[PDB]
Amino acid sequence: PFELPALPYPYDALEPHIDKETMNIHHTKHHNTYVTNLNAALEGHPDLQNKSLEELLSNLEALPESIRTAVRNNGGGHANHSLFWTILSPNGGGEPTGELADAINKKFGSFTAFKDEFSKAAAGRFGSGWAWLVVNNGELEITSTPNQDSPIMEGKTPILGLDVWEHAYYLKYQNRRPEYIAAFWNVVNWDEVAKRYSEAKA
C-alpha cells in the first residue's frame, strides 16, 4: 500500500524560510492523514491496490462512485505533498540551468518573468489550492488547482508546486501569503525540477 515518504532533510533544514514546527506538522499529520485515508479507501478493492497514484488519478472516471471523491482528495493530497518535499532543499535557491532554464526562457522570456507569473498565480488562488509549473505534452505552463486536485487528473505532469493551503504558512506568516511565496524561492531544489523536467519530456 501507500506509505508516507521520509524527508531527505531535517525538519529545521529550511529555516528561516519555513519553520520547523510547520514542517513537522505538515508532514507527520497533514500528509500522513492523506496516506492513511487513501489506503482506507482502497481496502475493499484489490482491483486497485496494485496501481500507481498516477494511474488512479488518470482514471478517476472508472473508480466506483463510493471512493472516487476519497481517492481524488486523499490521492491528490499524497501525490502533491510527495512532490513538494523533493523540490525543497536547504542547499536550494538560485536559478535553473541547462535545458530547463532554456525552456523557461523561451516560454516566459526570462527567469524573472517566470517567478512573477508563478508568484502571481500562487497569490491569486482563492481559498485552498496549489500553484504549479507543469509539462503539458512537451510544453511548460503555469497553472493552479483547488484543494488537493492534482494536475495529473488533467493529463499534465507537475515538476514544481507550491502549497498555498493556509496550514503551509500560517504559523509563521499568518495572512501574509505573499512573503511566504517570496521565501519559497530561496529553497527551491532546481536540480530536482530539472530531473523531473528531463523525465516528463519523454
Interface residue list for a second copy (CB under 8 A): 25, 29-30, 33, 73, 126-129, 146-148, 165-167, 170-171, 174-175
Which of the choices a second copy, Mn ion, none does residue 25 contact, using the CB cut-off of 5 to 8 A by kind?
a second copy
C-alpha cell at 2: 501507500
In the complex, least distance from residue 25 CB atom to a second copy, rounded to whole angstroms: 6
- 200/117 Cα distance (integer angstroms): 21
Closest approach, Cβ 152 to a second copy, in A, equals: 18
Residue 163, contacted partner among a second copy, Mn ion, none, CB below 5-8 A by kind: Mn ion
Query: What is the rounded CA–CA span in Å between residue 162 and residue 125?
Result: 11
Alpha helices in the chain (DSSP H): 20-25, 32-42, 53-58, 65-70, 76-86, 98-108, 111-124, 170-173, 177-184, 190-200
Give the per-residue contact string, 158-197, with Mn ion (x = CB under 5 A; - = no). Answer: -----x-x--------------------------------
Rounded Cα gap, residues 30 and 116, in angstroms: 29
Select from a second copy, Mn ion, none the partner in contact with residue 86, using the beta carbon and a kind-dependent cut-off of 5 to 8 Å.
none
Strand partners, 135: 140, 157
Residues that bind Mn ion (CB under 5 A): 163, 165
